[PDB]
């Protein structure tokens, strides 16, 4: 339980640092979730992408 007083110990007894944490925490979270949707997608669909076309370079 000692991380709960220590995380309030440092940052928000102030109101501009706080607005850093909700803006900058909106980014690491948006990139943590865009990364996991973009790897559950290319694992359900193997052999179905555009770069998996066996005759791609050669039309002639």
């Amino acid at each position: 339980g000692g991380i709960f007083e220590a995380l309030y110990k440092v940052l928000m007894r102030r109101n501009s640092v706080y607005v850093t944490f909700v803006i900058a925490g909106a980014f690491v979270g948006e990139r943590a979730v865009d990364y996991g949707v973009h790897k559950l997608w290319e694992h359900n669909n193997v052999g179905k992408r555009y770069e998996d076309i066996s005759v791609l370079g050669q039309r002639q």
Binding site: N15, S16, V17, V19, T20, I23, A24, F27, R31
Partner: peptide, 29 residues
């Protein structure tokens, strides 16, 4: 006074690093 100075500065460095947080977007870090 002098608190409201610096307390103007802490969230004046929020805009800078909050509009430096919606357009150009180095995103690995």
């Amino acid at each position: 006074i002098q608190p409201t100075d610096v307390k103007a500065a802490a969230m004046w460095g929020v805009a800078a690093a909050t509009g430096g947080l919606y357009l150009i977007q180095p995103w690995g870090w």
